Amino acid sequence: GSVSARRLAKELREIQSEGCPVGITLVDASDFSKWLFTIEVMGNSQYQGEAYTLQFRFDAQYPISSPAVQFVVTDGKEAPVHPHVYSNGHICASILGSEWSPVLSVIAVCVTLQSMLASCKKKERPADNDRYVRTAPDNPK
Amino acid sequence: GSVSARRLAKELREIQSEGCPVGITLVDASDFSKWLFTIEVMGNSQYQGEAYTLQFRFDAQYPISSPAVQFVVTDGKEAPVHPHVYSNGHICASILGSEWSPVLSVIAVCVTLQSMLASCKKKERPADNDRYVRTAPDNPK
């Protein structure tokens, strides 16, 4: 297999071996192009008791390229209302952009986004939400 | 004078007689095209002891057209760090956008933006800040 696929296989092996951190659940890893997790924020937060679906898409340059990561908003699912999360599910987070590194992992991204949700003291959408979502491309990258 | 200027003269007249609400200071109304205020939040808030320069620009259609309103960032001044305030001083606030009414006033806007800064718990920039500022014109409208 390819270098990229093998890296993803190893991450999947580790998720199976180590399990996921609390509140994070692997729902589907049926290929090495798209995976789905559920994310629940634990402790005291604005999202208590809710589970959101988070999608990772991988291109052939992973892990050098960052994964394309978004909350799923299909089939009645809604994105968390958060200042760094657009209503279409796209996410503004440094880990997905300038601060991506191959030293990170899918699970590290999940934990980081869980913590970003946990840090919110007041649920509101991004300022440019409507502007962004009107012209937003399929892939948030 | 024009209808707009007379409306602004009336607002200036009221400001003169009854005064600006606490935290709000008029510093310049030398014509009926551009005014300057300072706004300061009273009490416990993330912005204590800080007074920000707020600039209003009016066109020939005020009060039908909304004023163009931005925090001033020239001459060493900096916009407050806030999720609805861009680093270039531009403001995302519905009172400046869709929910502007000719039935509102310049002081109403000052009060609204003052409240906006008082309601905030974490000084952070908008998610789209750097994307916005490189593309942003002189006029926020």
**Distance between CA B54 and CA A87 in Å, rounded?**
30
Residue A92 contacts B, CB cutoff 8 Å: yes
3-class SS string, B85-128: ECCCCEECCHHHCCCCCCCCCHHHHHHHHHHHHHCCCCCCCCCC
Rounded CA separation A18/A36 (Å): 18
Whether residues B128 and A124 touch (CB distance < 8 A) is answered with no
- Write down the domain spans for chain A: 1-141
Q: Distance between CA atoms of A4 and A99, rounded to whole angstroms? A: 20
Task: List CB contacts of B88: < 8 A, sequence separation 6 or more.
Answer: B70, B73, B79, B132, B133, B136
* d(CA B92, nearest CA chain A) in Å: 6
List the catalytic residues of B. 92
Which residue type does B20 have?
A: C
Resolution in A: 1.7
Task: Determine the topology of domain B1-141 in CATH.
Answer: Ubiquitin Conjugating Enzyme (3.10.110)
ω before A63 within 30° of 0 (cis)?
yes
Cβ of residue B99 closer than 8 Å to a chain A Cβ: no
